[PDB]
Amino acid sequence: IHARSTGPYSMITQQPLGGKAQFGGQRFGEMECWAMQAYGAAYTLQELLTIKSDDTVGRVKVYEAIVKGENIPEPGIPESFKVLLKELQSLCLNVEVLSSDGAAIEMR
Amino acid sequence: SAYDTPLGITNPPIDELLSRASSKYALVIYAAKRARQINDYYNEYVGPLVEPGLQEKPLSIALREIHGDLLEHTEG
Amino acid sequence: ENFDIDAEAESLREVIRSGKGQKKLRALKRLKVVAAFQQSGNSPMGMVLDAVPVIPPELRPMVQLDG
């Protein structure tokens, strides 16, 4: 048996830990994402893979929004994507996300 | 045909909901936006259209109002 | 820097046209990598690093372990 609404996070990764000792979360694998996508539940999966795991503003904002009893904020900037963008830019690959029409942007 | 009195989270029936939208995927957002609105009301900012219960959840209100046919959607 | 790309392209075209066989085969792998820089905006100048980027501090963190 193991449960976690929120708790103490890891320093290295920014997703909840594994195990009952550290009061960890529970692992949401690829095969769960496959099934979420087979349902076609974009919002559930995109909630699971952003605020429920990674996003540092996201988790505190959603906790705050839940305890206040307000609308859940739209999860914007996952830590994984920042990590991969910075990591790709570290290997000297210039990656810039263009819009449908107009000029490109930084995430923040 | 014979509904056999459904109760709780299965009420209102999903077939009577599905009929309102084109596909269930539309019904999800079609509800969730109304849920987002009735969430906003407590702070459009339209109120609960169908009679709200003792401690009924925003979702159920939206589905009851879609079952009542008090809303319309716009396929983007 | 001392390189005009369209020359290598138009030379490659006559090489794959005329030199059909092993030389066309070796030109075939060159075609894509050469022709990329014409259709794309980015220059081949960025293959050599005057400056090297540094990954953020926390992706390579130094934290003290228990004990």
C-beta separation of B66 from B58 below 8 A: no
What is the least distance, in Å, from the CA of A69 to any CA of chain B? 8
Name the token pair of C13: 């075209």
What is the least distance, in Å, from the CA of C64 to any CA of chain A? 11
> Chain A contacts of B28, Cβ < 8 Å?
43
C-beta separation of A104 from A96 below 8 A: yes
The sign of the torsion formed by the CA atoms of A73, A74, A76, A80 equals positive
Provide the 8-state DSSP code for A89: H
Q: Which domain holds residue B7?
A: 1-76
- Phi then psi for residue B48, to 5 deg, are -70, 120
What is the least distance, in Å, from the CA of A38 to any CA of chain B? 12
Domain count, chain B: 1
Q: How far apart are CA B52 and CA B41, in angstroms?
A: 13
Interface check for A104 against chain C (CB to CB < 8 A): the answer is no
Nearest Cβ partner for C53 among A11, A83, A90: A90
- Report the C-alpha dihedral over residues B67, B72, B74, B75, rounded to 10 degrees: 20
* C-beta atoms of A71 and B39 within 8 A: yes
Among A49, A41, A65, A36, smallest CA distance to B36 is for A65
Resolution for this experimental structure (Å): 4.2
Q: What share of chain A is helix, strand, coil (3-state, %, to 5)?
A: 40, 0, 60
Determine the residue type at A96: E
- Phi then psi for residue C13, to 5 deg, are -60, -50
Interface check for A89 against chain C (CB to CB < 8 A): the answer is yes
Q: How far apart are CA B20 and CA B75, in angstroms?
A: 12
* C-beta atoms of A43 and B43 within 8 A: no
B4: left (phi over 0), alpha (psi -120 to 50) or beta: left
Q: How far apart are CA C32 and CA C19, in angstroms?
A: 17
From chain C residues 19-58, the ones with a CB under 8 A of any chain A CB are 42, 46, 49, 52-56
Q: How far apart are CA C66 and CA C63, in angstroms?
A: 10
Name the token pair of A23: 């009061």
- How determined? cryo-EM
Q: How many CB atoms lie within 10 A of CB C3?
A: 10
Q: How many CB atoms lie within 10 A of CB A30?
A: 7
* C-beta atoms of C53 and A83 within 8 A: no
Long-range contacts of B12-15 (CB under 8 A, 24+ apart): B12/B63, B12/B64, B12/B66, B12/B67, B13/B67
* C-beta atoms of B40 and A40 within 8 A: no
- Phi then psi for residue B30, to 5 deg, are -55, -40
Positions of E strands within chain A: none
Three-class secondary structure of residue B61 per DSSP: helix
Q: How far apart are CA C15 and CA C26, in angstroms?
A: 10
Three-class secondary structure of residue B63 per DSSP: helix
What is the least distance, in Å, from the CA of B67 to any CA of chain A? 22
